[PDB]
Amino acid sequence: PKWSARAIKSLAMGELEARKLKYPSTGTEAILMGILVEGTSTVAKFLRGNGVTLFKVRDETLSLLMYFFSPEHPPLTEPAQKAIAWAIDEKNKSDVDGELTTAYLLLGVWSQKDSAGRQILEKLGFNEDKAKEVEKSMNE
Ligand SMILES: [Cl-]
Numbered sequence: 001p002k003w004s005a006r007a008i009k010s011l012a013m014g015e016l017e018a019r020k021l022k023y024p025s026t027g028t029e030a031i032l033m034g035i036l037v038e039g040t041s042t043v044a045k046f047l048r049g050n051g052v053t054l055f056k057v058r059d060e061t062l063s064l065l066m067y068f069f070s071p072e073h074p075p076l077t078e079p080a081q082k083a084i085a086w087a088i089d090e091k092n093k094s095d096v097d098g099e100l101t102t103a104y105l106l107l108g109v110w111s112q113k114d115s116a117g118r119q120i121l122e123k124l125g126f127n128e129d130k131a132k133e134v135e136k137s138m139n140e
Contacts, residue, residue: 001088004099006041011084011105013037018074022067027077028109028117029061031084041102042137052124060120079115083108096139103138107131 014034018026035044036054047053076084087108091100109117110131 002099004101006038006102007100007105010034010038010041010102015074019072022070023065023074024067024070025077026074026080028079028083028112028115029057029064029120031080031105031109032117032120033057033061035102035106038102043101043103043106043134046134046137047106047126050125050130052121052126056124057120060123061116064116064119079112079117083112083115083117086111101138103134107135107138 011031011034014030014032014037015026017033017037018030023030033054035041036047036052036057038044039048039054083105085108087100087104090107091098091104109115110121110126112118
């Protein structure tokens with residue numbers, strides 16, 4: 001359970017993005033946006049290179065989701081929770097030492113097949129080959 005600095009900034013950026021945008025909860029789409037707002041990790045550059053950018057993610061999000069009753073603190077959705085749990089679980093069995101980077105967080109969103117993050121990623125051109133490609137990057 002040792003989070004990289006860029007993973008921590010990402011989540012923080014995701015939750016703040018959820019408040020900025022007046023969302024009733026903080027979901028997988030915020031995690032994904034959090035990574036891109038952070039923007040300096042290996043996986044963020046990878047996404048940005050394969051046509052997945054904040055602008056397009058922000059856009060693809062409206063195409064999914066008025067909202068005038070959102071709480072001051074948008075709680076994590078169950079899929080967001082499941083994506084973070086997935087990142088923990090994958091790292092605790094990786095049979096290697098290391099911190100859990102933003103790539104684990106991205107594969108966590110990707111592992112949640114009903115999630116808004118899963119959808120948006122596909123809608124932008126992300127696929128299983130690219131996920132094995134990121135999973136290869138996370139191991140070098
Ligand atoms: Cl990282």
